[PDB]
Ligand binder design. Structure first.
Ligand SMILES: Nc1ncnc2c1ncn2[C@@H]1O[C@H](COP(=O)(O)OP(=O)(O)OC[C@H]2O[C@H](O)[C@H](O)[C@@H]2O)[C@@H](O)[C@H]1O
Length: 168
């Protein structure tokens, strides 16, 4: 399919990037898959997760609570596919390592591997916020791991400007 993603800078054959709020991109484009930067409990408190969930009027959290009650916590580096509610067809919840709490940064590669199960994704930079991974490292792992088409939404202008003039 062809989506209405617009204004993205090309990084590689398959990776694109834009200084944008992932919630606003999802609202506008209504992609097949939006990625959430989750924790293992799917407790969507802040950052991407909290913003996505708020935009679903808490439906994402209600669904997530049932998912956890049935299946238990995700693995660090793991994922699950749930509804995208009013934002997207699906939300791929992906858990990057919480480097600030001692989790192995190498699991960020495992996290991004989940993206390869989907042809097209709108996504954030996993682990680059409250989880404490260096943002340029997360971008490099994404580029070096994801082979499917990924549209990265970077909320923070200063960060975007730095990332797009860094080597990959
Ligand atoms: N609306 C947004 N749109 C795009 N990028 C955003 C947005 N908000 C933040 N970012 C950027 O997205 C990147 C990721 O920041 P984070 O969302 O913290 O994800 P993590 O993987 O580090 O932490 C996961 C925890 O965050 C939640 O609390 C979860 O519930 C988890 O507990 C950073 O570069 C942000 O600037």
């Amino acid at each position: 399919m062809v989506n209405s993603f617009s204004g993205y800078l090309k990084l590689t054959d398959n990776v694109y990037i834009k200084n944008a709020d992932i919630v606003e991109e999802a609202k506008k484009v209504k992609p097949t898959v939006v990625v959430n930067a989750a924790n293992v409990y799917l407790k969507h408190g802040g950052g991407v997760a909290g913003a996505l969930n708020k935009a679903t009027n808490n439906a994402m959290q209600v669904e997530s609570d049932d998912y956890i009650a049935t299946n238990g916590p995700l693995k660090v580096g793991g994922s699950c596919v749930l509804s995208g509610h009013n934002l997207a067809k699906h939300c791929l919840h992906v858990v990057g390592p919480n480097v600030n709490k001692g989790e192995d940064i190498q699991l960020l590669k495992s996290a991004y591997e989940n993206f390869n199960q989907h042809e097209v994704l709108l996504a954030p930079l996993l682990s680059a916020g409250i989880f404490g991974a260096d943002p340029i490292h997360s971008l490099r792992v994404c580029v070096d791991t994801v082979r499917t088409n990924v549209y990265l939404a970077v909320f923070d202008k200063n960060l975007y400007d730095k990332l797009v003039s860094s080597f990959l």
